[PDB]
Amino acid sequence: WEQYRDRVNMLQQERIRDSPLLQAAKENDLRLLKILLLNQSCDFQQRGAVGETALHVAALYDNLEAATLLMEAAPELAKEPALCEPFVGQTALHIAVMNQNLNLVRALLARGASVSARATGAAFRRSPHNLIYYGEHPLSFAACVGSEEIVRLLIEHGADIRAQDSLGNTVLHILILQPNKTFACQMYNLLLSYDEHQSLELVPNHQGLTPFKLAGVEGNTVMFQHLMQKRKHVQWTCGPLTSTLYDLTEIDSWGEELSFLELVVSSKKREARQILEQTPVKELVSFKWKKYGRPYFCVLASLYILYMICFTTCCIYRPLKLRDDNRTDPRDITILQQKLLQEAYVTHQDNIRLVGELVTVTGAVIILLLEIPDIFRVGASRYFGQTILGGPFHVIIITYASLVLLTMVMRLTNMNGEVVPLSFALVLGWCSVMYFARGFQMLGPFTIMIQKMIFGDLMRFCWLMAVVILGFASAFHITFQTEDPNNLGEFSDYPTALFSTFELFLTIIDGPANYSVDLPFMYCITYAAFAIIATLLMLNLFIAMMGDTHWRVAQERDELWRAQVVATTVMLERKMPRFLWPRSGICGYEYGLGDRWFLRVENHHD
Amino acid sequence: WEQYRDRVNMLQQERIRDSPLLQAAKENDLRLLKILLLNQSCDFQQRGAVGETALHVAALYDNLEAATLLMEAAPELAKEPALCEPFVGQTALHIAVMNQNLNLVRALLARGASVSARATGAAFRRSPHNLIYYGEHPLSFAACVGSEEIVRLLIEHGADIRAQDSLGNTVLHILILQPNKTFACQMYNLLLSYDEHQSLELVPNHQGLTPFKLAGVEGNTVMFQHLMQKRKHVQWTCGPLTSTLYDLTEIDSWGEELSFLELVVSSKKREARQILEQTPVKELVSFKWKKYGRPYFCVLASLYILYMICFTTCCIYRPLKLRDDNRTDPRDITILQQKLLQEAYVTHQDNIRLVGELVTVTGAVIILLLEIPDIFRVGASRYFGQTILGGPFHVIIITYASLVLLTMVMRLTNMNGEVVPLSFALVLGWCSVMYFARGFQMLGPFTIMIQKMIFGDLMRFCWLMAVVILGFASAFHITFQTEDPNNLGEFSDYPTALFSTFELFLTIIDGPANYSVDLPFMYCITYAAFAIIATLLMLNLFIAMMGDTHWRVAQERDELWRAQVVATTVMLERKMPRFLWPRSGICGYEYGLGDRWFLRVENHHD
């Protein structure tokens, strides 16, 4: 990590300092350099810590004169790379190109340096440890530093433009992976000037991503917008309005199983949801949602609501009989118990409950056979972690299906205790109805904010709240274990003390006070303290935290709801059959553009 | 104070007005001045209220001609200081320098004025009464007014640059103690031009503070940032990225027991936490926290959590026996009492509680032997007042250790009433778990907010809330002392009336209403008034106060949490042994910089 870089820089400066030729290349004294290069006893392959030559040290400090005398004395230093771990394939040409010393680039290319050298060291791979990712080849380095003369001078000296690094990225892929600057857009066009003929636009990297698809994934809105300037065809401009015919070949992806929209919307980048607001994409997903996605989603929502109604009705009419044994014990109030399977189905209403329970198990298995292929296809971390795709709703529908199958297992083999998985199944299944709230303007962002404040604010409150509950429950249990439990039984034992002071924290029960007896004064003192610092302070400031968090994330949830109706639309196609989802757009056979399908957008501008 | 300054200005103007020579120096009439200076009967030492000469009055009103005539008639006025209390070392050279009358400075230095005169008056000491602090020597005065010609003209006329005032400050120390202006940075470099050789940078004042350390303490971010321009060494700039080698000699302070970071973070200045965000300091404390401070802090947090689990389990299983005497009295519900020490330890579970209680007392004494040296070393006001160092958590851990030792004292010598210190110990110790919330992004600033409204907002609410509780408790006790206490006993006597209307203020109990009896109409009227002006008005506006206060201090708590993880990191070193905390940075032996240890930072800039 960072200490490895500090140690290798320490060893680099030590081997530079203890060697006279590398030090003479470092601070560039000409006389000692001429004295050392007038010697002919040994070849000049003396190296530093990473295996860098003296020409690497000359190109590192922009020592042009030192580099000219080193390749005058030994012209074989241009073909020698560094050898050790952080710089495995770095040559002097990479250092000369990336420092933008153009005459040094001419001097290295005049002596025959390798133009297709892959700098496969650990300081050049795409990692969060490295601050930049300029690629491996010097062509990608010259494309990334933004010098047109150096990248052209590499082009007539070689520099095969379809070369790939160890991650599979070509030069345009690395140009997409840059901070959004001025030169990064026309350097793309300058390298498309030398494409001259399959192309460079249609070659993927090792993730299988087109540069159009990679620009969609990485959130590069400027590069995507300027790539869609070359894929549109204006028809006419009849006054203040024009009709643009955008191409949907690389956006819609009708016959390709990883679509472009699925790659955009299932991305771990924050900026990738901005591309869903771009002018060929937004009208496409708006047409797909308003024509097909919204009525099918409202049909599936009503079907799931009716299936919850059937499951709730089958829960309510559960077969329960009278308790066989006598209680013979105070404090216990259970009077009913579960019927055995031999007696659970004897009447007509039990047969109605039987066919409703097979409807429930059928709904459970068609949830599981619909979601387990989505577990196996899309990666299991991205399926649950992405709140755009509906990750928490997916994990609660998976555990709801698991709990209702476990209840059916405990119904066939007679096991007491169906109350616990039935109550978890009812809570999680009815909370899964909020997945269908995302299709509405009114309900979607509110459901987003309840996920943002379960995930962000509720844990922040509860890791202090449980501390206060533990301390004051211990204090209440000390001050009320010497008293009669039949008068104030709120703190009779420690689980009841924890639960009752949790309810006193949330103020959902009354303060325990019995005016017919004398409570201890210590309870009054520590309950006055508890009511001051928890009900008055922490609850109202939790209201303040949720208000300020709502005000800050209110700008993000409005554009993230529109980013997840696109995820809903992409989910609704390729799962329902193709006859319900026709191809979006119109064919370009009549326009003379061929087999490609196009989107016509009518746009006025003054 | 201010009236002393008004009285001494009153006496100054009276002695100037009643003397003809000082008045002639004041409004500068040349003819009466020549008439008075043509006399030779008496020596010209007539003084004002503070002992100021006529040359002081001439230099006060920028009377250059009058001052040249006074030192023409009597050239010994240049060596005469004012004598009384607010100006006891002030000469005419201080007034000439600080008014920036440069020809007057030439005229004073031509006649032989004292260049090393210490102006030790009460108007020149570092006090909140004085509006400026320009030092004592005229060299510091010329450095502070920002005139380069006057400070140079003092340099070839003398003005020993290592001179110290009565507070111990040298000239650079006083330049640090200035408002951040233009000239205050290059006046520092201009006085470092004549350092020429143990230097001026390494001399401390009477607090033992280096000017680097004083610039760290006083919040001077500009002076600190420009002091690290001279203590950094760039290695190379290989394209868009450079590698800077900052010095950690005066920052880290490995072998010095008052470290620089401890002087910065335990400071009573608001701006001193900004220096923790500077480019040599922030990476140092980030490396120290993310490598060593966070896992050791999470180990100590889990150890203290397990210690409180042990203390809570020892509290829950407290030895209590049945009450020996009969109650023979209604309204009393206590049935258990404390076991004596002869019968408290008879079984195996009592032996488990015994070894847990010795674990508790061992934890208490290793809290006390860890904190009482921090009471004695760092000053006791700064240890509790600083919320960055954990002041409230320190005082509650001190009183928690005191209460659990008092409980052990009451356990060896049999005294009834262990409930009160056990309940205070449980509340304060479980709230002392919350000191470990500062090591997390999620939990730290929320705990900062709750201490900011213990000390800021809860006092503001309760000094009105207790007034409303007192008035309405008195009203409820008057309207319910003529009634039967067995029907509505909420206001049967006055402590119950105070406590019950406190609960009615916080709405943690129901409104007392018995529909089987006729309550007085006066209770209904004053309870409608109480529910209008307290539950509806003051509670919701306390929510509004804490919301608006949260929005206002939300900018400061985010940079104050990052300022107190530095305090946590400085606390974690020099207390744990040195083998767990290795030296941060890398040695500069390989770089040729010597014994000093350096921090390598990799920084990209376009």
JSON list of C-alpha atoms in Angstrom, two decimals, chain A residues 1-3 5-7 9-14 17 26 60-61 90 95 98-99 131-132 134 145 455-456 459-461 463-464 467-468 470-472 474-475 477-485 487-488 494 504 507 509-513 515-529 531-533 535-538 540-545 548 551-552, chain B residues 235-241 243 287 291-292 312 315-318 320 327 330-338 418-420 422-424 426-427 430-431 433-434 437 441-443 446-447 449-450 453-454 458 461-462 465 485-486 489-490 496 499-500 502-503 506-510 539 542-543 546-547 550-551 554-555 557 586-587 589-592 600 602-604 606:
[
{"chain": "A", "resi": 1, "resn": "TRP", "atom": "CA", "xyz": [0.00, 0.00, 0.00]},
{"chain": "A", "resi": 2, "resn": "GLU", "atom": "CA", "xyz": [1.35, 3.42, 0.99]},
{"chain": "A", "resi": 3, "resn": "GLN", "atom": "CA", "xyz": [4.21, 2.05, 3.11]},
{"chain": "A", "resi": 5, "resn": "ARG", "atom": "CA", "xyz": [5.46, 2.93, -2.00]},
{"chain": "A", "resi": 6, "resn": "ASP", "atom": "CA", "xyz": [7.43, 4.79, 0.69]},
{"chain": "A", "resi": 7, "resn": "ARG", "atom": "CA", "xyz": [9.82, 1.83, 1.07]},
{"chain": "A", "resi": 9, "resn": "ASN", "atom": "CA", "xyz": [10.97, 5.24, -3.01]},
{"chain": "A", "resi": 10, "resn": "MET", "atom": "CA", "xyz": [13.43, 4.95, -0.09]},
{"chain": "A", "resi": 11, "resn": "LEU", "atom": "CA", "xyz": [15.27, 2.11, -1.87]},
{"chain": "A", "resi": 12, "resn": "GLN", "atom": "CA", "xyz": [15.08, 3.99, -5.20]},
{"chain": "A", "resi": 13, "resn": "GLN", "atom": "CA", "xyz": [16.72, 7.10, -3.75]},
{"chain": "A", "resi": 14, "resn": "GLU", "atom": "CA", "xyz": [19.29, 4.95, -1.91]},
{"chain": "A", "resi": 17, "resn": "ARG", "atom": "CA", "xyz": [22.52, 8.05, -4.30]},
{"chain": "A", "resi": 26, "resn": "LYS", "atom": "CA", "xyz": [19.80, 12.85, -11.30]},
{"chain": "A", "resi": 60, "resn": "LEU", "atom": "CA", "xyz": [12.45, 11.42, -14.65]},
{"chain": "A", "resi": 61, "resn": "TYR", "atom": "CA", "xyz": [13.95, 14.83, -13.82]},
{"chain": "A", "resi": 90, "resn": "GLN", "atom": "CA", "xyz": [8.02, 0.87, -17.63]},
{"chain": "A", "resi": 95, "resn": "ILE", "atom": "CA", "xyz": [8.54, 8.71, -18.63]},
{"chain": "A", "resi": 98, "resn": "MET", "atom": "CA", "xyz": [4.08, 11.38, -19.63]},
{"chain": "A", "resi": 99, "resn": "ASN", "atom": "CA", "xyz": [6.35, 14.29, -18.64]},
{"chain": "A", "resi": 131, "resn": "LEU", "atom": "CA", "xyz": [-3.97, 8.19, -8.21]},
{"chain": "A", "resi": 132, "resn": "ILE", "atom": "CA", "xyz": [-4.15, 8.13, -12.04]},
{"chain": "A", "resi": 134, "resn": "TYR", "atom": "CA", "xyz": [-3.13, 6.45, -17.91]},
{"chain": "A", "resi": 145, "resn": "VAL", "atom": "CA", "xyz": [-1.60, 13.75, -21.02]},
{"chain": "A", "resi": 455, "resn": "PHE", "atom": "CA", "xyz": [-29.96, 2.49, 6.53]},
{"chain": "A", "resi": 456, "resn": "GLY", "atom": "CA", "xyz": [-28.46, 5.82, 7.61]},
{"chain": "A", "resi": 459, "resn": "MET", "atom": "CA", "xyz": [-28.67, 2.77, 13.17]},
{"chain": "A", "resi": 460, "resn": "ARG", "atom": "CA", "xyz": [-27.18, 6.13, 14.23]},
{"chain": "A", "resi": 461, "resn": "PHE", "atom": "CA", "xyz": [-30.05, 6.61, 16.67]},
{"chain": "A", "resi": 463, "resn": "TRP", "atom": "CA", "xyz": [-26.49, 2.60, 18.75]},
{"chain": "A", "resi": 464, "resn": "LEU", "atom": "CA", "xyz": [-26.96, 5.43, 21.30]},
{"chain": "A", "resi": 467, "resn": "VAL", "atom": "CA", "xyz": [-26.93, 2.34, 25.39]},
{"chain": "A", "resi": 468, "resn": "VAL", "atom": "CA", "xyz": [-29.36, 4.67, 27.20]},
{"chain": "A", "resi": 470, "resn": "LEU", "atom": "CA", "xyz": [-29.29, -0.50, 28.96]},
{"chain": "A", "resi": 471, "resn": "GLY", "atom": "CA", "xyz": [-28.10, 2.04, 31.53]},
{"chain": "A", "resi": 472, "resn": "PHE", "atom": "CA", "xyz": [-31.51, 3.22, 32.66]},
{"chain": "A", "resi": 474, "resn": "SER", "atom": "CA", "xyz": [-30.13, -1.33, 34.93]},
{"chain": "A", "resi": 475, "resn": "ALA", "atom": "CA", "xyz": [-30.88, 1.70, 37.15]},
{"chain": "A", "resi": 477, "resn": "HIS", "atom": "CA", "xyz": [-33.99, -2.73, 37.93]},
{"chain": "A", "resi": 478, "resn": "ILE", "atom": "CA", "xyz": [-31.75, -1.78, 40.87]},
{"chain": "A", "resi": 479, "resn": "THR", "atom": "CA", "xyz": [-34.26, 0.69, 42.27]},
{"chain": "A", "resi": 480, "resn": "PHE", "atom": "CA", "xyz": [-37.24, -1.68, 41.84]},
{"chain": "A", "resi": 481, "resn": "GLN", "atom": "CA", "xyz": [-35.96, -5.14, 42.87]},
{"chain": "A", "resi": 482, "resn": "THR", "atom": "CA", "xyz": [-36.46, -4.48, 46.60]},
{"chain": "A", "resi": 483, "resn": "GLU", "atom": "CA", "xyz": [-40.15, -3.65, 46.09]},
{"chain": "A", "resi": 484, "resn": "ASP", "atom": "CA", "xyz": [-43.36, -5.61, 45.58]},
{"chain": "A", "resi": 485, "resn": "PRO", "atom": "CA", "xyz": [-43.70, -6.62, 41.89]},
{"chain": "A", "resi": 487, "resn": "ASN", "atom": "CA", "xyz": [-47.75, -2.87, 42.50]},
{"chain": "A", "resi": 488, "resn": "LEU", "atom": "CA", "xyz": [-45.40, -1.57, 39.78]},
{"chain": "A", "resi": 494, "resn": "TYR", "atom": "CA", "xyz": [-34.42, -7.46, 33.51]},
{"chain": "A", "resi": 504, "resn": "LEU", "atom": "CA", "xyz": [-40.52, 4.78, 28.03]},
{"chain": "A", "resi": 507, "resn": "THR", "atom": "CA", "xyz": [-43.05, 7.35, 25.08]},
{"chain": "A", "resi": 509, "resn": "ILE", "atom": "CA", "xyz": [-46.51, 3.77, 27.45]},
{"chain": "A", "resi": 510, "resn": "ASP", "atom": "CA", "xyz": [-47.27, 5.96, 30.45]},
{"chain": "A", "resi": 511, "resn": "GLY", "atom": "CA", "xyz": [-44.73, 6.73, 33.13]},
{"chain": "A", "resi": 512, "resn": "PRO", "atom": "CA", "xyz": [-45.11, 4.07, 35.83]},
{"chain": "A", "resi": 513, "resn": "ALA", "atom": "CA", "xyz": [-46.59, 5.77, 38.88]},
{"chain": "A", "resi": 515, "resn": "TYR", "atom": "CA", "xyz": [-50.24, 6.87, 43.85]},
{"chain": "A", "resi": 516, "resn": "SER", "atom": "CA", "xyz": [-51.67, 4.34, 46.32]},
{"chain": "A", "resi": 517, "resn": "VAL", "atom": "CA", "xyz": [-48.13, 3.24, 47.32]},
{"chain": "A", "resi": 518, "resn": "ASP", "atom": "CA", "xyz": [-44.87, 5.03, 48.13]},
{"chain": "A", "resi": 519, "resn": "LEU", "atom": "CA", "xyz": [-42.42, 4.64, 45.28]},
{"chain": "A", "resi": 520, "resn": "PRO", "atom": "CA", "xyz": [-38.70, 5.12, 46.06]},
{"chain": "A", "resi": 521, "resn": "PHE", "atom": "CA", "xyz": [-37.33, 8.63, 45.65]},
{"chain": "A", "resi": 522, "resn": "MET", "atom": "CA", "xyz": [-34.44, 7.20, 43.62]},
{"chain": "A", "resi": 523, "resn": "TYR", "atom": "CA", "xyz": [-36.90, 6.13, 40.91]},
{"chain": "A", "resi": 524, "resn": "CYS", "atom": "CA", "xyz": [-38.24, 9.70, 40.83]},
{"chain": "A", "resi": 525, "resn": "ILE", "atom": "CA", "xyz": [-34.73, 11.19, 40.53]},
{"chain": "A", "resi": 526, "resn": "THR", "atom": "CA", "xyz": [-33.47, 8.84, 37.81]},
{"chain": "A", "resi": 527, "resn": "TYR", "atom": "CA", "xyz": [-36.79, 8.96, 35.96]},
{"chain": "A", "resi": 528, "resn": "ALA", "atom": "CA", "xyz": [-36.66, 12.77, 35.96]},
{"chain": "A", "resi": 529, "resn": "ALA", "atom": "CA", "xyz": [-33.13, 12.45, 34.55]},
{"chain": "A", "resi": 531, "resn": "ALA", "atom": "CA", "xyz": [-37.23, 12.00, 30.90]},
{"chain": "A", "resi": 532, "resn": "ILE", "atom": "CA", "xyz": [-34.90, 15.00, 30.55]},
{"chain": "A", "resi": 533, "resn": "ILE", "atom": "CA", "xyz": [-32.07, 13.44, 28.53]},
{"chain": "A", "resi": 535, "resn": "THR", "atom": "CA", "xyz": [-37.57, 11.80, 25.73]},
{"chain": "A", "resi": 536, "resn": "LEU", "atom": "CA", "xyz": [-36.93, 15.55, 25.64]},
{"chain": "A", "resi": 537, "resn": "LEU", "atom": "CA", "xyz": [-33.43, 15.64, 24.14]},
{"chain": "A", "resi": 538, "resn": "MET", "atom": "CA", "xyz": [-32.69, 12.61, 21.96]},
{"chain": "A", "resi": 540, "resn": "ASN", "atom": "CA", "xyz": [-36.58, 15.67, 19.34]},
{"chain": "A", "resi": 541, "resn": "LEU", "atom": "CA", "xyz": [-33.03, 15.81, 18.02]},
{"chain": "A", "resi": 542, "resn": "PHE", "atom": "CA", "xyz": [-33.71, 12.58, 16.11]},
{"chain": "A", "resi": 543, "resn": "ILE", "atom": "CA", "xyz": [-36.59, 14.55, 14.56]},
{"chain": "A", "resi": 544, "resn": "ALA", "atom": "CA", "xyz": [-34.03, 17.30, 13.81]},
{"chain": "A", "resi": 545, "resn": "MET", "atom": "CA", "xyz": [-31.59, 14.80, 12.23]},
{"chain": "A", "resi": 548, "resn": "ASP", "atom": "CA", "xyz": [-31.90, 18.00, 8.09]},
{"chain": "A", "resi": 551, "resn": "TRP", "atom": "CA", "xyz": [-33.43, 18.60, 3.36]},
{"chain": "A", "resi": 552, "resn": "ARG", "atom": "CA", "xyz": [-29.94, 17.53, 2.26]},
{"chain": "B", "resi": 235, "resn": "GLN", "atom": "CA", "xyz": [11.39, 14.83, -5.06]},
{"chain": "B", "resi": 236, "resn": "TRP", "atom": "CA", "xyz": [10.16, 14.74, -8.66]},
{"chain": "B", "resi": 237, "resn": "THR", "atom": "CA", "xyz": [7.14, 15.76, -10.75]},
{"chain": "B", "resi": 238, "resn": "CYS", "atom": "CA", "xyz": [6.63, 12.85, -13.15]},
{"chain": "B", "resi": 239, "resn": "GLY", "atom": "CA", "xyz": [3.83, 14.28, -15.24]},
{"chain": "B", "resi": 240, "resn": "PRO", "atom": "CA", "xyz": [0.62, 15.35, -13.50]},
{"chain": "B", "resi": 241, "resn": "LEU", "atom": "CA", "xyz": [1.74, 14.04, -10.08]},
{"chain": "B", "resi": 243, "resn": "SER", "atom": "CA", "xyz": [5.92, 13.48, -4.45]},
{"chain": "B", "resi": 287, "resn": "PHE", "atom": "CA", "xyz": [-2.27, 7.55, 8.68]},
{"chain": "B", "resi": 291, "resn": "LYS", "atom": "CA", "xyz": [-3.43, 2.27, 10.79]},
{"chain": "B", "resi": 292, "resn": "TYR", "atom": "CA", "xyz": [-3.04, 2.25, 14.59]},
{"chain": "B", "resi": 312, "resn": "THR", "atom": "CA", "xyz": [-24.27, -4.81, 35.03]},
{"chain": "B", "resi": 315, "resn": "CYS", "atom": "CA", "xyz": [-25.48, -5.36, 39.80]},
{"chain": "B", "resi": 316, "resn": "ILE", "atom": "CA", "xyz": [-28.41, -7.56, 38.69]},
{"chain": "B", "resi": 317, "resn": "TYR", "atom": "CA", "xyz": [-27.40, -10.50, 40.91]},
{"chain": "B", "resi": 318, "resn": "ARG", "atom": "CA", "xyz": [-26.99, -8.34, 44.04]},
{"chain": "B", "resi": 320, "resn": "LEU", "atom": "CA", "xyz": [-30.80, -9.34, 48.78]},
{"chain": "B", "resi": 327, "resn": "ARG", "atom": "CA", "xyz": [-44.41, -3.87, 57.44]},
{"chain": "B", "resi": 330, "resn": "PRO", "atom": "CA", "xyz": [-50.02, 0.63, 54.34]},
{"chain": "B", "resi": 331, "resn": "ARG", "atom": "CA", "xyz": [-48.56, 2.58, 51.36]},
{"chain": "B", "resi": 332, "resn": "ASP", "atom": "CA", "xyz": [-45.16, 0.83, 51.80]},
{"chain": "B", "resi": 333, "resn": "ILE", "atom": "CA", "xyz": [-44.21, -1.93, 49.36]},
{"chain": "B", "resi": 334, "resn": "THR", "atom": "CA", "xyz": [-40.57, -2.78, 50.08]},
{"chain": "B", "resi": 335, "resn": "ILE", "atom": "CA", "xyz": [-40.14, -6.52, 50.71]},
{"chain": "B", "resi": 336, "resn": "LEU", "atom": "CA", "xyz": [-36.39, -7.11, 50.22]},
{"chain": "B", "resi": 337, "resn": "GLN", "atom": "CA", "xyz": [-33.37, -5.66, 51.98]},
{"chain": "B", "resi": 338, "resn": "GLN", "atom": "CA", "xyz": [-29.60, -5.82, 51.69]},
{"chain": "B", "resi": 418, "resn": "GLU", "atom": "CA", "xyz": [-26.25, 0.93, 47.96]},
{"chain": "B", "resi": 419, "resn": "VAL", "atom": "CA", "xyz": [-29.14, 1.48, 45.51]},
{"chain": "B", "resi": 420, "resn": "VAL", "atom": "CA", "xyz": [-28.36, 5.21, 45.10]},
{"chain": "B", "resi": 422, "resn": "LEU", "atom": "CA", "xyz": [-25.25, 1.74, 42.16]},
{"chain": "B", "resi": 423, "resn": "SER", "atom": "CA", "xyz": [-27.91, 3.50, 40.08]},
{"chain": "B", "resi": 424, "resn": "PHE", "atom": "CA", "xyz": [-25.75, 6.62, 39.60]},
{"chain": "B", "resi": 426, "resn": "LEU", "atom": "CA", "xyz": [-24.86, 2.38, 36.17]},
{"chain": "B", "resi": 427, "resn": "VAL", "atom": "CA", "xyz": [-26.24, 5.53, 34.49]},
{"chain": "B", "resi": 430, "resn": "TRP", "atom": "CA", "xyz": [-23.17, 3.34, 30.63]},
{"chain": "B", "resi": 431, "resn": "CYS", "atom": "CA", "xyz": [-23.14, 6.93, 29.42]},
{"chain": "B", "resi": 433, "resn": "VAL", "atom": "CA", "xyz": [-19.52, 3.98, 26.84]},
{"chain": "B", "resi": 434, "resn": "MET", "atom": "CA", "xyz": [-20.53, 6.90, 24.56]},
{"chain": "B", "resi": 437, "resn": "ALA", "atom": "CA", "xyz": [-18.67, 6.77, 19.72]},
{"chain": "B", "resi": 441, "resn": "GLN", "atom": "CA", "xyz": [-18.24, 8.51, 11.14]},
{"chain": "B", "resi": 442, "resn": "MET", "atom": "CA", "xyz": [-21.84, 7.64, 12.02]},
{"chain": "B", "resi": 443, "resn": "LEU", "atom": "CA", "xyz": [-21.93, 8.12, 15.80]},
{"chain": "B", "resi": 446, "resn": "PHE", "atom": "CA", "xyz": [-24.40, 13.10, 16.89]},
{"chain": "B", "resi": 447, "resn": "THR", "atom": "CA", "xyz": [-22.77, 12.71, 20.32]},
{"chain": "B", "resi": 449, "resn": "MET", "atom": "CA", "xyz": [-24.57, 17.55, 19.11]},
{"chain": "B", "resi": 450, "resn": "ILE", "atom": "CA", "xyz": [-26.00, 16.04, 22.28]},
{"chain": "B", "resi": 453, "resn": "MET", "atom": "CA", "xyz": [-27.39, 20.76, 23.78]},
{"chain": "B", "resi": 454, "resn": "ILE", "atom": "CA", "xyz": [-26.69, 19.55, 27.29]},
{"chain": "B", "resi": 458, "resn": "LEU", "atom": "CA", "xyz": [-31.34, 22.03, 27.83]},
{"chain": "B", "resi": 461, "resn": "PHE", "atom": "CA", "xyz": [-35.31, 25.09, 28.17]},
{"chain": "B", "resi": 462, "resn": "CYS", "atom": "CA", "xyz": [-35.20, 24.03, 31.85]},
{"chain": "B", "resi": 465, "resn": "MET", "atom": "CA", "xyz": [-39.61, 24.81, 32.23]},
{"chain": "B", "resi": 485, "resn": "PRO", "atom": "CA", "xyz": [-56.44, 11.94, 47.62]},
{"chain": "B", "resi": 486, "resn": "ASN", "atom": "CA", "xyz": [-57.63, 8.36, 46.95]},
{"chain": "B", "resi": 489, "resn": "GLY", "atom": "CA", "xyz": [-53.59, 11.33, 43.80]},
{"chain": "B", "resi": 490, "resn": "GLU", "atom": "CA", "xyz": [-51.43, 13.08, 41.21]},
{"chain": "B", "resi": 496, "resn": "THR", "atom": "CA", "xyz": [-45.81, 14.63, 43.91]},
{"chain": "B", "resi": 499, "resn": "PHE", "atom": "CA", "xyz": [-43.07, 15.53, 39.71]},
{"chain": "B", "resi": 500, "resn": "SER", "atom": "CA", "xyz": [-46.50, 14.83, 38.20]},
{"chain": "B", "resi": 502, "resn": "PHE", "atom": "CA", "xyz": [-43.19, 17.68, 35.24]},
{"chain": "B", "resi": 503, "resn": "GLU", "atom": "CA", "xyz": [-44.46, 14.45, 33.67]},
{"chain": "B", "resi": 506, "resn": "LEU", "atom": "CA", "xyz": [-43.20, 16.23, 29.05]},
{"chain": "B", "resi": 507, "resn": "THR", "atom": "CA", "xyz": [-46.48, 14.33, 28.29]},
{"chain": "B", "resi": 508, "resn": "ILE", "atom": "CA", "xyz": [-45.10, 11.02, 29.54]},
{"chain": "B", "resi": 509, "resn": "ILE", "atom": "CA", "xyz": [-48.18, 10.33, 31.69]},
{"chain": "B", "resi": 510, "resn": "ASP", "atom": "CA", "xyz": [-51.86, 10.74, 30.90]},
{"chain": "B", "resi": 539, "resn": "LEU", "atom": "CA", "xyz": [-42.28, 21.53, 23.64]},
{"chain": "B", "resi": 542, "resn": "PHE", "atom": "CA", "xyz": [-37.96, 23.35, 21.88]},
{"chain": "B", "resi": 543, "resn": "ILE", "atom": "CA", "xyz": [-38.06, 21.03, 18.85]},
{"chain": "B", "resi": 546, "resn": "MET", "atom": "CA", "xyz": [-32.91, 22.29, 18.52]},
{"chain": "B", "resi": 547, "resn": "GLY", "atom": "CA", "xyz": [-33.66, 22.01, 14.79]},
{"chain": "B", "resi": 550, "resn": "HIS", "atom": "CA", "xyz": [-28.66, 21.85, 14.62]},
{"chain": "B", "resi": 551, "resn": "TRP", "atom": "CA", "xyz": [-28.76, 23.60, 11.24]},
{"chain": "B", "resi": 554, "resn": "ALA", "atom": "CA", "xyz": [-23.90, 21.51, 11.56]},
{"chain": "B", "resi": 555, "resn": "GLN", "atom": "CA", "xyz": [-21.06, 23.29, 9.74]},
{"chain": "B", "resi": 557, "resn": "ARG", "atom": "CA", "xyz": [-19.55, 19.79, 14.31]},
{"chain": "B", "resi": 586, "resn": "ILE", "atom": "CA", "xyz": [10.32, 7.46, 7.03]},
{"chain": "B", "resi": 587, "resn": "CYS", "atom": "CA", "xyz": [13.90, 8.41, 7.88]},
{"chain": "B", "resi": 589, "resn": "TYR", "atom": "CA", "xyz": [19.12, 9.03, 5.72]},
{"chain": "B", "resi": 590, "resn": "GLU", "atom": "CA", "xyz": [18.60, 7.70, 2.19]},
{"chain": "B", "resi": 591, "resn": "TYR", "atom": "CA", "xyz": [17.53, 11.12, 0.87]},
{"chain": "B", "resi": 592, "resn": "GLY", "atom": "CA", "xyz": [20.64, 12.81, 2.27]},
{"chain": "B", "resi": 600, "resn": "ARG", "atom": "CA", "xyz": [6.06, 11.32, 1.74]},
{"chain": "B", "resi": 602, "resn": "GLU", "atom": "CA", "xyz": [1.79, 11.86, -3.42]},
{"chain": "B", "resi": 603, "resn": "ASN", "atom": "CA", "xyz": [-0.24, 14.74, -4.87]},
{"chain": "B", "resi": 604, "resn": "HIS", "atom": "CA", "xyz": [-1.69, 15.22, -8.34]},
{"chain": "B", "resi": 606, "resn": "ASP", "atom": "CA", "xyz": [-4.02, 18.52, -13.34]}
]
